Structures are given as structure tokens and as C-alpha cells.
Design a protein around this ligand. Structure first.
Ligand SMILES: O=P(O)(O)O[C@H]1[C@H](OP(=O)(O)O)[C@@H](OP(=O)(O)O)[C@H](OP(=O)(O)O)[C@@H](OP(=O)(O)O)[C@H]1OP(=O)(O)O
Lengths: 102, 102, 102, 102, 102, 102
């Protein structure tokens, strides 16, 4: 499901922010020789799924229609204390209130 | 919204400290050819809004129109045991008293 | 057996991402002059096992059938806020309820 | 209030240890063209104030009159488990007992 | 007894992977001139004792009489979420239930 | 409290391992023109106190009679889970039980 260099073998490091992830997302796409429309929805589906579950959760959180920028800001912070500062608090409240998960 | 290398793109990384983000910001603002008043407010609107939810929200935390010193000290602590530490024990207290959020 | 430079000796770094470790494994694997199928069943048997208990455990966790992509998506979650948030989330309440372990 | 390269613009990176930040301060101070006395008092009034709220709170904590060595010893520990750990332990207990803050 | 570089000094960077440390042990062991066997038992007695108190601890948990491989399977989990996660949960529940220690 | 480059000015980075620090110090000590004996009297008191509050305290923690074997063997874990697993496992029991400190 994606050969080396192909935008399909492109993924946001588990810790890689969206801002860092995104840059290369398209650099490796440019490596892929696909029409814009071919790469377009790829630019979309490959980006988000391969965008590190912290971001995917955010991206999905931003609700569809999100802009590469909107997701970018929310999932950009993914990586440094910018986002993590908050996630430690929420992850913490993810267990305190939501400890029971079914 | 925001072209590459523009002060608009300029986004304090999450971990990106204010003194750091702020340093490349203005170096970058210098790079975008804008009028004085244009850079004058970009220096503002792009510095606080795209200032990494930690620093950014800090500026807003300090209170709007915050003196560069107020956002600087407050955000110049972003990335160190000075501020980062505050986030570890404090967010921890956001879930202690403020865990119930609606 | 499984001395250095062998896909056997190929163990995802403790923190080496499935995206990297897979590359390492697949880089040291190619370096390993094994039959194609041999590499493939190593890719199947060695990978899952010598893949960093975080990814490794996941591999088994996704349940058999995990395409290289499934173990990839699941083991790609591992390494940052995406998954770490969760590991922290469970290791925390596993201790709370599941503290009693026999 | 403080131009670039001036000791006024000199600020201990949040994580920047005092040992590193002191060098950058004085190295930069050398760069700043201020009388020996003017540099000497910057060395005092600037070094402390722009010394990373962590080392900065340590300087005051050591108590005014702290010899550069005193702030150095205490503010040198800033940046690693040396100080960061102590902070984790103190901040940790600052929320346990001191959580109520007015 | 045991000066720098001599395997005796050979120690796992506490965060250093067992695999790397071990490589350092063995890479440097080769550097420490001994009888074939002498280097080997060092490989045993020194490695466990000087391999990151966590791995040092794992090894004992790996079963006195641990093979270099077994500990390799476990200590490899060190330096990674494999262990960072596990330690977090255990230290977490040990203090909670086992808080009273005598 | 020690001139630059002198073994007196030799200080284990707050994160600097004792292994690295012990090595920095001894090289620096050789650089430090302390008599053959003075270096030995330096290698003793300086090495213990300037070696990063984490080790430094450990050195005292090992209790008097701590030979390089004790401080190196303890302060070795400094930097990662070896020494630190204790910092995180015990801190948990240092604040929970010992939070009240007078
Ligand atoms: O110990 P690791 O699992 O390898 O985590 C490290 C560790 O961070 P923590 O303070 O959270 O433990 C580093 O700090 P030190 O071990 O050197 O103290 C830190 O880097 P800084 O020193 O610059 O704060 C770095 O975080 P990062 O590089 O993201 O800023 C992070 O590594 P990972 O999160 O990538 O595992």
C-alpha cells in the first residue's frame, strides 16, 4: 500500500507534527508523477490517514471541510508542548472521566 | 491564506519558544516585502495568532495588547523548566478542579 | 543464531518507529541476501516479533491478517502524542482498575 | 526596549542553561558597546531578568547578592534532571498541597 | 578496579538502548584485552551490572541464568515506549498499592 | 568557585551522565594543572559536588565510602530510566507519602 518515495509510502511520524509532516507529504507527492486530480484526493486521503493518529483524531475533530491550514494549526501543534501541553491535560481527563471505555 | 515564507505561514512551532519563533518571525517578516504599516500589524496579528497555541494563548492569557515584554517573558519561558514545568503541574490541576468541562 | 546484520538481529529500536524500523528491517532485510519469499516470511515472522514490543505487540494485536499496512497503521501510531497519549491513558487506568494482576 | 544583538535582547532560552546563557550573555555583552560599568550592571540587571524564568526565579531564590557562581551553580542545574527533576518533584508537590492558590 | 574504556567502565547510557549499549559493551570489550572466556564472562557479569539499572533490573526479571538473547528481547523494550510505558504503569501501581515499603 | 576549564569549573551537565561527566572531568582535570596529588584530592571532593545535583546527591546518597564504583554505578543511570526509573518510581512515593516536608 505504497512504495518508497511514493506519496503512498509517506507518513506523519507518530511524533511528527502536521506542519512537519505536511511539508514532505507533498515533497514526496512531487516525486510521484501523478496529475493534479490524481494527486488531489491523494493529497487529501493519504495526508490525513498517514498523518499520525494524533492529527487524524484532530482532523476528524475539526470536522470535514477542514482546510489544510485549519488541520495544520490543530495538528501542527502535534509534537511539541504547544499541543502536548494541552493533550497531557486532556489525555489525563480522557482517563479520569472516560476511564471506563466500552 | 498565507503564502510560503510569508509571515502568514510563520507559525510558532508547538515547542517553538517565543524568543525562537519571534526571532525567525521578524527575520521572515523582513523577507515578505510589505509596507511599514503592513509589517507593523503583521508583526502583531501574525505574531500572536499563529504563535503556537502555548505562546499564542499565553499572549491572550496575559491579556490583549500585551507588551512584547509581557508575551516575551511569559512565552520566553515556553520551552523551559520555567514555563513547561508550569504546564505539567498546572494542566494536571486543570483536570483536578476543572475536569468537568462543558 | 540471529547474529548482527540479520533480519533476525533486526529489532526495531525501542523507540524506532514502525515507519523507520520497517525501513530498517526492510533495509537490513534487503542487505540480508535471503530468498524473496524467505525475506517475505521474515517480513512476516521476524518483523512482527523483532519489531519493538510497542509495534511488535501491536502486530499480534491487530490480529492475524494485519496487512503490512495494518501493522503499519497500528505500529505507526506508536512514537508520539497519537499513541503515547493512549499508552499513558491505559497504563494509568490499567493500574487504577486492573492493578490487581494475576 | 532592547535591540537585537544587544544584551537587552539577550535572553536565556527557556531550556538554555545558565551555563550556556551566561556565555551567550557575556559574549553578546562584549558585542554590545557599553561602558565596562554599563556592561557590568547589565551583567547584573539584565543577566538575572532575561535569564529564563527558571534560572531567573532561582537567581532571586538564591537571594539578591547571589554571586554569579551562586546563580551559576543553581541555574546550571537548569536544563536537565538536575533541576528539572527537582522542579518536577516541587511543582508536583506545589499542586498537591499548594493546589489552592490565591 | 575497572578504569574508563575497560569494559568495567562500559555502561549503557541510561537512555541508551541495550542493543547499542551492548554493542558498546562488546565493541569496547573487544577493546578490553582479556582471555576469550574472560571477555565472555565479563559479557555476562559486567553487562547485567552496568547495563542501565532498568535493564539491570530486567535482566534479573528475565530469570537468573538469562541468555543474552532473552534480555535482548526485554532490555530492547527499554529506551522505548515498550518499557517507558511498562515502567510508568508499574511504578504507578507500585506506589499506589505498595506505597508502604519497609 | 573554580576558573574556566579548571577541574573546579568542571560540572556535569544537569543531564550529562556521570559516565560522560566523569570523562569530561578527568580529561579536564589532566588539563587542570593540579599536582599529581592535588588532582587526586580534586578528583574526590570536586567530582562529588560539581557532578550534577542528581549524581551529586546520589554520591552522598551512596553514603560516605562511595568509591568511583558506587557513584559511577549509581550516577550511571543518570540521564535515562536506569537512574531515572527510580526518580519517577520514587518521586511518586516521595510526594505521595512525603509530600509534607519540613
Ligand atoms: O527520553 P525520551 O523518550 O528519549 O524523550 C526525550 C526527552 O524528553 P522528556 O523530558 O519528556 O523526558 C528529551 O530530553 P532529555 O532526555 O535530553 O532531558 C527531549 O528533549 P529536550 O531535552 O530538548 O527537552 C525530547 O523531546 P523533543 O526532542 O521532542 O523536544 C524527548 O524525545 P521524544 O519525545 O522524541 O521521544
Amino acid at each position: 500500500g505504497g512504495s518508497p518515495t511514493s506519496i503512498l509510502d509517506i507518513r506523519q511520524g507518530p511524533k511528527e507534527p502536521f506542519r512537519d509532516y505536511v511539508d514532505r507529504f507533498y515533497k514526496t507527492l512531487r516525486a510521484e508523477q501523478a496529475s493534479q486530480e490524481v494527486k488531489n484526493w491523494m493529497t487529501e486521503t493519504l495526508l490525513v490517514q498517514n498523518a499520525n493518529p494524533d492529527c487524524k483524531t484532530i482532523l476528524k475533530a475539526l470536522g470535514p471541510g477542514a482546510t489544510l491550514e485549519e488541520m495544520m494549526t490543530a495538528c501542527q501543534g502535534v509534537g511539541g508542548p504547544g499541543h502536548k501541553a494541552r493533550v497531557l491535560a486532556e489525555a489525563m481527563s480522557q482517563v479520569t472521566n472516560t476511564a471506563t471505555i466500552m
